[PDB]
Ligand binder design. Structure first.
Ligand SMILES: [Mg+2]
Ligand SMILES: [Mg+2]
Ligand SMILES: [Mg+2]
Ligand SMILES: [Mg+2]
Ligand SMILES: [Mg+2]
Ligand SMILES: [Mg+2]
Ligand SMILES: [Mg+2]
Ligand SMILES: [Mg+2]
Ligand SMILES: [Mg+2]
Ligand SMILES: [Mg+2]
Ligand SMILES: [Mg+2]
Ligand SMILES: [Mg+2]
Ligand SMILES: [Mg+2]
Ligand SMILES: [Mg+2]
Ligand SMILES: [Mg+2]
Ligand SMILES: [Mg+2]
Ligand SMILES: [Mg+2]
Ligand SMILES: [Mg+2]
Ligand SMILES: [Mg+2]
Ligand SMILES: [Mg+2]
Ligand SMILES: [Mg+2]
Ligand SMILES: [Mg+2]
Lengths: 92, 53, 74, 59
RNA sequence: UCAGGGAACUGAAACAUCUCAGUACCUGAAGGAGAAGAAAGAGAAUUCGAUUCCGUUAGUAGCGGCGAGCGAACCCGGAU
RNA sequence: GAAACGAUGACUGAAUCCGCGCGGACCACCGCGCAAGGCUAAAUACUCCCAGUGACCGAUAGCGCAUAGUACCGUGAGGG
RNA sequence: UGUUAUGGCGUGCCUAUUGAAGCAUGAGCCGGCGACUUAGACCUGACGUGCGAGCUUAAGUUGAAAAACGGAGGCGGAGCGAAAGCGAGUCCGAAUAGGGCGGCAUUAGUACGUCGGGCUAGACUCGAAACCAGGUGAGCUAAGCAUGACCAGGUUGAAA
RNA sequence: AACCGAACCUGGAGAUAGCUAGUUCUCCCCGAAAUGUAUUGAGGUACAGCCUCGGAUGUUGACCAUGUCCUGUAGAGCACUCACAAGGCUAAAACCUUAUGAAACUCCGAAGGGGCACGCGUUUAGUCCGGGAGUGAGGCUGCGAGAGCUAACUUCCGUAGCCGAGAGGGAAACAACCCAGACCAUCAGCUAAGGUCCCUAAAUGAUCGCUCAGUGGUUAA
RNA sequence: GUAGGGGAGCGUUCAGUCCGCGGAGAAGCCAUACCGGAAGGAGUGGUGGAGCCGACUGAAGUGCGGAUGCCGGCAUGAGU
RNA sequence: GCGACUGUUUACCAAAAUCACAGCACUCUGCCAACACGAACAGUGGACGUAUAGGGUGUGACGCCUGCCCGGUGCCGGAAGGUCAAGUGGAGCGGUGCAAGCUGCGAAAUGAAGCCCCGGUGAACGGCUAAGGUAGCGAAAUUCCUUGUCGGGUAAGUUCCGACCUGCACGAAAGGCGUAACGAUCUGGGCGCUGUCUCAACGAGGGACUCGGUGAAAUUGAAUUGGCUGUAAAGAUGCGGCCUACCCGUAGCAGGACGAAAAGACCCCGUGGAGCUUUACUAUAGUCUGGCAUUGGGAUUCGGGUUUCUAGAAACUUGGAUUUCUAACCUGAAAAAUCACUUUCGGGGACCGUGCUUGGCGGGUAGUUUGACUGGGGCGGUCGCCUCCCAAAAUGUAACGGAGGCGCCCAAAGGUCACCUCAAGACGGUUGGAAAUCGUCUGUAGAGCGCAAAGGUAGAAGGUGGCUUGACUGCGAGACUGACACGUCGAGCAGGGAGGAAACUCGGGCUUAGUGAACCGGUGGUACCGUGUGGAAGGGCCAUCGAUCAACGGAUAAAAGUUACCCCGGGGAUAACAGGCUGAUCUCCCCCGAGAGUCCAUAUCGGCGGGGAGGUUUGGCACCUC
């Protein structure tokens, strides 16, 4: 009860909503084939988890031609996919 | 900090158009009518605050 | 009677010829015993502290007035 | 145990523990200004070791 | 197994809400099993399609002198 | 608790097909759904009984009993 | 090896304790019974094995002197925040002060096993006074009811 | 129904038990604690402190010397404050001569003590992360205090050392006191404190004295 | 060297595997001057009348002097 | 003395002065009675009774009697007003949708018992500020001081009887004061008689003893178990030194073995238990009360409504009070006992009961609470914060150790800017002549600083005017301090300020006290969540508000007592006995000599002081034994 657990002043607000699967650029570029990912290959590409949508963010910085279909992506990730050429699709 | 019916008081605050709380104890003893000071609200700051409420 | 009084603290926190850092609390005192020299600031409670880094120097006047200063290290 | 969740025992990347500062939460204020934004960020881990035992699974 | 009725010590390091637990006990009805069942539903896909059972979701979502503590369901995998 | 919905003890007791209940105060929209009638194997639980087994006991162990609810105790429930 | 005479030395054991030969606890003696477990896909560590940027299965199905199948799910894989959200950045704030953190100069996991702990259950074994539920008792005793039985002998001498 | 401030039997029920007892095979390596803070807390729990194991770091530890600073005790002193001793002086006081007392007075003031740097030199532990703890009732003596009666095998702190958990020699006996820390063996030798007439090991030793009391081997005015 | 942590090990039961022994006598029981750093383990002798060491690994209802502990037997007081 | 009396009670330590008792009193109850058992509108006891009856309560034959105080409490009765639940009623506020509309909340008026309020009652609880003791009694079963004071009896009388009265704290139905008789009652005294005794003796029998037969028990670490003195956890056969002592029994004794017996029943400890209590907390049987249901009709009063011929009336009327009817319902009678029936009916009657809800009352029951410190506990005291001393020249440090303060204040006592300098004495000055205001002289301050004290302060923090809101927002390099959580100080960066010409200073006050973690809610702001979606409800974030949570790190939102009827778990951690150490107080001795002793201190006597002994006193301490 009273040993420094209560007496501790927090409330906050609990939600914990939508959580995206992290897909590193560093993985996608460098190795493999640029296999033209979509949502298909992700199963065998060792990105298979599911339960949640898929999201792409920039980690490793390298030039390649790549085209990735995910649910969402970041600004600098978009920038890095386009800078080395490519496209990232999103549903409406 | 204890509070009750007594003299002085803990006084509340607001401004022209600015929405803000200074909360300074006023004192009804010698003089309290105007609680007016210069205090600086949400945005533009730099204005007059009426702590008279 | 039964009034157990109080803990307080005081003491002189950083001694002479000690290398302190900027922000170090030098002396905890009541009034001004030690007075702020060159390099040394003084807070509300008349604490003496350091504005820079360097060797700590004590100045003694015949008591009645004292000083703490900081000689640069560099 | 289900208390410590929305309240902060919160765990970090290093497996350290976030409580911060209680100084005055809601009742009993009307003293100074930097005690009030003195609502903080900070903790010791001496009592973290047994803290997160309460938060263990949903950290 | 279903139902009518329904404890306290104990836990909260005291104690009233809480916990013990619808547990123990009494009672009624019945079979080899019972209960349950054929959406005025679950649910957020304009998905699913009676019930029960197991795994699982998941100590999650939540309930609480927000204390001690309590704790789902949908999806999904199987028995049938 | 903002407490919906099911459930009833009391008092009240509307529609029925451009109708009716639901979707967690509430409204619109949107979407699922037809209550106030019954029956309904199988997957499930248990071990009085029988069988087969065991890094289960082997006479102070193993059920209490290598048979005994006997001797024995109690008015008795009961114990043994 | 057995026994012994003399010499020297010599304050039972256990618990409980500041302190025990204690005039403090326990215990007649010998035998046998007799106390730190077990359970969960719990948590956290040490060691060990297998794969390893991946590692495992659960229920069940099929075989069952045998084990295989079963990817539902779980753990790594990104952090920050009250959250919406954003992302190697995230937060508080009107941009620069900081908390958390990735980079590190570099720090890989997961499944199984044994063990060190933790949590939930009796949780090392033995010990309460009590509390609650359902029943058994007035053949003892406390009274009631119905119905029967009983009080040698002597003294006293009221109303009418 | 031989034990009624709520009968008896079974059951919940292995109630709960901050309480008491008990807790069995061996050798080895470490090694404590009875302090601090909070507690419907005081014989109890949590955290810290002290123990052990493992990893890393790897002299940062340790004593002692030099240099540097901080201090207001012992003492002392009367310059402030309170107290007080004889006299001078003059509407009590002030004031002068002489003279003292002080934890809550101080013009002064050590020894020692603490921080830091350094190694001039000897040593040889420290620190961080992670696993398991136990102890949170102390005792005595010398020193420095408060209580107390300048009593107590008292009580409460500070400080060393020992017992605690320490056997061995000494002090008849005798936890703490004196000397000294037991790995094992021996019918070998040197010493410490203590001792050297007989009971027991060892000079009924040496020289110069003192005491005639059994002082020695029961205290004072 | 006490609580406490760490390390090596001894013994008992069951279990799998290996080596085996036993009516020219098993386990157990009894005596003993030997071995081992200890838990312990051998040798020969005496009883016994069916079974049983040793090695390696695994699993424990696995090691008693105490608990006014449990069952049993037998002492003391005493020929009182 | 006590009770009047026979009687009755603690099976197994109390037979009584306890209980009962006839008699007395208060009060309740009109009869399906009050009242009581009861899941129950069943039934029954009251009672096949019915107001010289029935319950409850307290006193306790009989006799004389029973006083003052209705403030508080209860109880009855009262009524103007004050407060109060559902409920009828519904101004308004709000969401939502294009809208009809659907929906969150909601007051005024009206609404019951009860409660505040008035009165009264004491053979109601009561008391001797509501009044204060009428009679009677009084050193009593009551009396502390106390063996009260006289007296009686006795050789002597702490008891006893009688008086008195100063009744520590008698007193009138929790009865006062008497009373013949009664008593295994209780106290004092006589007579008688005795082995109770001075003071024991002899005799008997039945056990004790011996022999033959049968033959237990509690206890038991093992014993090969002496005395003194000392030491040891403080009371030694088992340690030391010294003494003693040939081996083994039988009859006997009870000093020791802290002998046996029962996990001390005393005491303290346990956030142990149980019985009881009440104006502790909380619920509740029970009970009262408003509305709704069974539950209906008509006359009549009153608020209104809709319909309609000239502010009237007719009226489907809707509700409230009275009145009254009757088919519901209740209930008695008649050949058919509890019922069902037909009835003349009889009576009650829309009540009563009963069901749902509303508010009250509710130790009748029921679950629980009722801190700690503490030289045992209790009572007193103390719980947080600040300052100095203790505190052993660093920090630190306990005690129911030595002194004092805080729970605020300050719109200016703050920011800045500018100037000013105090206390006190001597001399001389009119309301003066200790102290005023003014004046010159000295004046490291001997003053001042809102409050406690320490430190600090003369180049000011002291005293003053000027302008003013830094008593700001966003943040924090680096440190002091704490086990933690708290706490403290702070350069500098920004947005924006204030004073100054300026360097610059300011994020409250010379500093150290002027305080409250969490939780649950109130208020303003921001718009993050918001459950099919767009909203809204509710939540979240930034401010803020409510704490003698004062036992002050805070136990629940909500809590007092008693046990001698007591129970369990423990404590020699901790009282009372004894011992132990101590020796203050207690007992005793000695030193001094002031004086008394006519004269002479020391025949005797020894003030004022001083030094020891003893361990028999009341203690301190808590060491062995709970
Ligand atoms: Mg209870
Ligand atoms: Mg409890
Ligand atoms: Mg009996
Ligand atoms: Mg038990
Ligand atoms: Mg271990
Ligand atoms: Mg002592
Ligand atoms: Mg010990
Ligand atoms: Mg033992
Ligand atoms: Mg005998
Ligand atoms: Mg005899
Ligand atoms: Mg009588
Ligand atoms: Mg009796
Ligand atoms: Mg008797
Ligand atoms: Mg005898
Ligand atoms: Mg005894
Ligand atoms: Mg006891
Ligand atoms: Mg008793
Ligand atoms: Mg600043
Ligand atoms: Mg709470
Ligand atoms: Mg509370
Ligand atoms: Mg009595
Ligand atoms: Mg005594």
């Amino acid at each position: 009860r009273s040993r420094l657990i209560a007496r501790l002043p927090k409330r906050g607000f609990n939600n914990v909503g939508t959580t995206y699967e992290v897909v590193k650029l560093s993985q996608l570029q460098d190795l493999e084939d640029t296999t033209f990912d979509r949502d298909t290959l992700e199963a065998y590409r060792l990105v298979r988890r599911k339960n949640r949508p898929v999201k792409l963010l920039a980690s490793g910085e390298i030039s390649r031609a790549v085209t990735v279909h995910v649910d969402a992506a970041s600004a600098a990730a978009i920038k890095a996919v386009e800078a080395a050429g490519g496209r990232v699709v999103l549903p409406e | 900090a204890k509070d009750g019916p007594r003299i002085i008081v803990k006084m509340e605050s607001s401004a022209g158009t600015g929405f803000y709380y200074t909360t300074t104890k006023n004192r009804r003893n010698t003089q309290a009518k105007l609680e007016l000071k210069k205090y600086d609200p949400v945005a533009k700051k730099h204005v007059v605050f009426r702590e008279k409420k | 009677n039964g009034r157990d009084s109080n803990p307080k603290y005081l003491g002189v926190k950083k001694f002479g010829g000690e290398v302190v850092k900027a922000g170090n609390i030098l002396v905890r005192q009541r009034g001004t015993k030690f007075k702020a020299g060159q390099g040394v600031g003084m807070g509300r409670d008349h604490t003496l502290f350091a504005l820079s880094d360097g060797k700590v120097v004590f100045i003694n006047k015949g008591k009645g007035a004292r000083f703490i200063s900081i000689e640069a290290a560099q | 145990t289900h208390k410590m969740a929305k309240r902060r025992i919160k765990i970090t990347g290093t497996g350290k523990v976030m409580a911060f500062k209680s100084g005055k939460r809601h009742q009993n204020t009307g003293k100074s200004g930097d005690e009030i934004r003195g609502k903080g960020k900070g903790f010791v881990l001496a009592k973290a070791e047994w803290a997160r035992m309460k938060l263990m699974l949903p950290r």
